[PDB]
């Protein structure tokens, strides 16, 4: 075995967790987009109906 010391092992684990968090941020951004767009569509329909009225 050629493991690095424990102190830097913590940093190695942090780097792997950083990769996972990097993926998670993009996932949340796509979530925000998919959430926000339908609300815009609904507001557009609402203002169109208000104009008709």
């Amino acid at each position: 075995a050629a493991r690095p010391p424990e102190e830097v092992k913590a940093a190695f684990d942090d780097a792997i967790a950083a990769r996972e968090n990097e993926q998670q941020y993009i996932r949340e951004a796509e979530a925000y987009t998919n959430e926000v767009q339908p609300r815009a569509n609904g507001q557009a329909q609402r203002i169109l109906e208000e104009a008709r009225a």
Binding site: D13, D14, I16, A17, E20
Partner: peptide
């Protein structure tokens, strides 16, 4: 019919099967 000294055949041992039971991640990665 030469037997390498670092082989298990140099000893009286024969390995018939090697398998992995479970592969886990460190608790931070998990």
């Amino acid at each position: 019919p030469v037997i390498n000294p670092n082989s298990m055949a140099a000893l009286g041992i024969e390995v018939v099967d090697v398998r992995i039971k479970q592969i886990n991640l460190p608790t931070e990665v998990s």
